[PDB]
Amino acid sequence: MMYVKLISSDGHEFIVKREHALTSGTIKAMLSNEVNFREIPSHVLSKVCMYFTYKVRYTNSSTEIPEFPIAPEIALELLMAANFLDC
Amino acid sequence: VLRSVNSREPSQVIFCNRSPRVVLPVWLNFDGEPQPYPTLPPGTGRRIHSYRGHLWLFRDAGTHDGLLVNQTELFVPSLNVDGQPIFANITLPVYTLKERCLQVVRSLVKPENYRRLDIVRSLYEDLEDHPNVQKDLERLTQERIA
Amino acid sequence: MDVFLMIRRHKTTIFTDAKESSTVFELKRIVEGILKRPPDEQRLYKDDQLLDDGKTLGECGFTSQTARPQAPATVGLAFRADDTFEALCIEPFSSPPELPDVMK
Numbered sequence: 001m002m003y004v005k006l007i008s009s010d011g012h013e014f015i016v017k018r019e020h021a022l023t024s025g026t027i028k029a030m031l032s033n034e035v036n037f038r039e040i041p042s043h044v045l046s047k048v049c050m051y052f053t054y055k056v057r058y059t060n061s062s063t064e065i066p067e068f069p070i071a072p073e074i075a076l077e078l079l080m081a082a083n084f085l086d087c
Numbered sequence: 088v089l090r091s092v093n094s095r096e097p098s099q100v101i102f103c104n105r106s107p108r109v110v111l112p113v114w115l116n117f118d119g120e121p122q123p124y125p126t127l128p129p130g131t132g133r134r135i136h137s138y139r140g141h142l143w144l145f146r147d148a149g150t151h152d153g154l155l156v157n158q159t160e161l162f163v164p165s166l167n168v169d170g171q172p173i174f175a176n177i178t179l180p181v182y183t184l185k186e187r188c189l190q191v192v193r194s195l196v197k198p199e200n201y202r203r204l205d206i207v208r209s210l211y212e213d214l215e216d217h218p219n220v221q222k223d224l225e226r227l228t229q230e231r232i233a
Numbered sequence: 234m235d236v237f238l239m240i241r242r243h244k245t246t247i248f249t250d251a252k253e254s255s256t257v258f259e260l261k262r263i264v265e266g267i268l269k270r271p272p273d274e275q276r277l278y279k280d281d282q283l284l285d286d287g288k289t290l291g292e293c294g295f296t297s298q299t300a301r302p303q304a305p306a307t308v309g310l311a312f313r314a315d316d317t318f319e320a321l322c323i324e325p326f327s328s329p330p331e332l333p334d335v336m337k
């Protein structure tokens with residue numbers, strides 16, 4: 001089982017499955033095993049990783065999909081991160 | 088082009104809202120013009136009378152976000168078997184993170200204030216580009232041709 | 234059933250899934266392959282409580298309702314350092330900025 005490390009601007013290290021990380025087109029182009037995001041804080045990058053899990057779990061599934069939650073306080077930076085990550 | 092066919096052949100359907108959104112069923116009339124039908128609260132189902140060859144799409148009733156019906160965009164009522172109505176299972180798509188983020192930001196900011204956000208020029212154009220059944224019908228029609 | 238987790242120690246966070254029937258020991262084997270520390274040098278926690286190896290994740294409170302893909306449950310991790318186990322320490326994520334004027 002392969003894993004990749006995504007590091008936030010504040011140095012938090014997020015270890016996610018390689019398959020999940022390849023959800024982001026930007027990340028997939030850099031890997032196809034450690035990426036540093038000097039602009040993405042941990043309160044945003046932790047949510048990016050939750051989205052990878054949510055996407056892999058519910059894509060091509062007929063079990064009722066729940067809403068992906070986003071607190072008002074992270075919405076703007078998560079929008080900036082998502083636009084750069086292409087996910 | 089994308090319109091309901093006037094078959095006059097009855098078809099019993101169940102609009103089943105398996106999503107957390109208030110759903111707006113939209114029927115494409117015989118001219119291709121979208122026609123709104125009564126909303127469906129989250130987690131509810133309605134037995135409706137439709138016809139074979141009719142076209143339907145489902146949206147979030149307040150924001151117009153695109154929803155899925157039987158894993159696709161359009162639902163077309165068909166012939167029933169032994170009194171079985173046709174289920175139209177309406178679900179949330181797995182939206183992109185970007186689109187999900189645009190939805191949340193549109194729900195918190197008044198449209199006159201989008202340009203007052205501290206973001207790149209491109210993200211203003213994405214925010215301003217509200218979900219629209221007419222624009223989506225244009226996209227579907229173009230994608231059907233090629 | 235699948236359960237979705239965040240295994241957290243200091244400034245490290247592992248995102249992983251496991252079965253509700255799977256054990257605390259099997260989660261340690263997952264941590265071993267990533268952080269290169271054997272299960273005997275690891276302590277797993279649910280809040281401040283040390284979890285036992287033979288217990289299932291479901292028995293530890295990790296269920297489809299609490300450990301979701303979009304809101305995973307937190308498992309605390311502490312390594313052994315020389316003679317003693319270090320105290321459980323989880324660095325919090327950064328503080329989001331104050332809501333803009335137009336977003337209130």
Ligand SMILES: CNC(=O)C[C@H](NC(=O)[C@@H]1C[C@@H](O)CN1C(=O)[C@@H](NC(=O)C1(F)CC1)C(C)(C)C)c1ccc(-c2scnc2C)cc1
Binds near residue numbers: 096102112133135
């Ligand atoms: C039970 N009554 C009906 O189904 C009735 C109604 N059903 C309709 O209005 C159906 C929907 C669509 O298939 C066109 N249509 C018609 O009946 C059309 N008639 C015909 O094509 C002909 F009769 C053959 C000539 C008409 C719009 C021109 C009148 C309806 C449908 C859905 C709802 C909804 S959508 C969300 N909640 C509910 C309950 C409500 C009413």
